[PDB]
Amino acid sequence: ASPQSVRALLERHGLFADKRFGQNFLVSEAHLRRIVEAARPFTGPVFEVGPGLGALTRALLEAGAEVTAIEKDLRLRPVLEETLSGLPVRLVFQDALLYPWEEVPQGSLLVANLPYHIATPLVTRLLKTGRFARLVFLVQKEVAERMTARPKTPAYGVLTLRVAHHAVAERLFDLPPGAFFPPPKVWSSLVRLTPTGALDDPGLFRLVEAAFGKRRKTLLNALAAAGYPKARVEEALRALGLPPRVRAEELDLEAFRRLREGLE
């Protein structure tokens, strides 16, 4: 609710949160409301990864969502059981990487608060299922930048292309450190993904992973390192009108698909 509310709730449960705690709790009601708005309409059940103290959980329920809140930090069990007491919510303590995503109804909604820098494993797991109608991510600003990056920019990489393959992305707004307690060192952002129904293309992503394997290598050399024969790659690049020493970061999703087809 605000820094003293949170601190007092955590202390009741013998917890101390500073910048090392592992998460950052929403204390901004204005931002809370905007997040609920981003997730509408509630046309499928919501799976909320990282409920924190349950602030968003409560707001989602009040807006008519059905929510399954999935929390990795077992220390928050007494806190959430209290804050969610008497509410129609399912509370699960589990690493979201292990949650049975293949069980969720097709058309479900995913809302995830992922405060850390490397979000790629989980985002990839969720998108590969093809089971969500909408995914809303509250992430570090730099992660949102990667998810929505243009070619030839610092943020551009495998995660950009994974997102683009499965979904249309929107960076909706940023959130300052002061919206959270403890305040994080970086700004956060809210990103909405609307899946297209595209499922994995595993051969495409073996190529894309290889292409971005080493930052300061040409695409030719990066693919050679993963066992794509240079002679075959050279020819494929020639056929596409690409520079012989073109770099992975210069290629868009369409170009990666054409390259993959060329090599097959």
Shared domain for 126 and 211, answered yes or no, is no
Shared domain for 249 and 188, answered yes or no, is no
DSSP-assigned beta bridge partners for residue 26: 180
Place of tokens 């030719």: 220
Q: What is the CATH number of the domain that holds 246?
A: 1.10.8.100
Shared domain for 194 and 206, answered yes or no, is no
Task: Count structural domains, the chain.
Answer: 2
Q: Where among 176, 199, 222 does a domain terminate?
A: 199
The domain in which residue 232 lies consists of 200-264
Within 10 angstroms of residue 254's Cβ, the number of other Cβ atoms is 9
Shared domain for 92 and 126, answered yes or no, is yes
Q: What is the dihedral of CA 81, 86, 92, 93, to 10 degrees?
A: 0
In order, the DSSP letters of the chain are: --HHHHHHHHHHTT---STTSS--EE--HHHHHHHHHHH----S-EEEE--TTSHHHHHHHHTT--EEEEES-GGGHHHHHHHTTTSSEEEEES-GGGS-GGGSPTTEEEEEEE-SS--HHHHHHHHHH--EEEEEEEEEHHHHHHHTPPTTSTT-SHHHHHHHHHEEEEEEEEE-GGGEESPPSS-EEEEEEEE-S----HHHHHHHHHHTSSTTS-HHHHHHHTT--HHHHHHHHHHHT--TT--GGG--HHHHHHHHHHH-
Shared domain for 131 and 217, answered yes or no, is no
Which tokens in the block code for residue 8? 């007092």
Q: Where among 184, 199, 214 does a domain terminate?
A: 199
Within 10 angstroms of residue 151's Cβ, the number of other Cβ atoms is 15
Q: What is the CATH number of the domain that holds 121?
A: 3.40.50.150
Q: Where among 199, 221, 250 does a domain terminate?
A: 199
Shared domain for 20 and 50, answered yes or no, is yes
Q: What is the dihedral of CA 113, 115, 118, 121, to 10 degrees?
A: -20
Closest CA to 45 of 101, 85, 84: 101
Which tokens in the block code for residue 106? 């097709």
DSSP-assigned beta bridge partners for residue 190: 138, 173
What whole-number distance in Å separates Cα of residue 144 and Cα of residue 148?
6
The reply, when asked if residue 221 is annotated as ligand binding, is: no
Task: Work out whether strand 188-195 and strand 46-49 pair parallel, antiparallel, or are unpaired.
Answer: unpaired
Shared domain for 52 and 159, answered yes or no, is yes
Shared domain for 173 and 190, answered yes or no, is yes
Shared domain for 19 and 53, answered yes or no, is yes
The residue type found at 180 is F
Experimental method for this entry?
Answer: X-ray
The reply, when asked if residue 113 is annotated as ligand binding, is: yes
Shared domain for 182 and 92, answered yes or no, is yes
The reply, when asked if residue 50 is annotated as ligand binding, is: yes
The reply, when asked if residue 26 is annotated as ligand binding, is: yes
Shared domain for 39 and 117, answered yes or no, is yes
Shared domain for 211 and 87, answered yes or no, is no
Q: Are 144 and 169 in contact (CB under 8 A)?
A: no
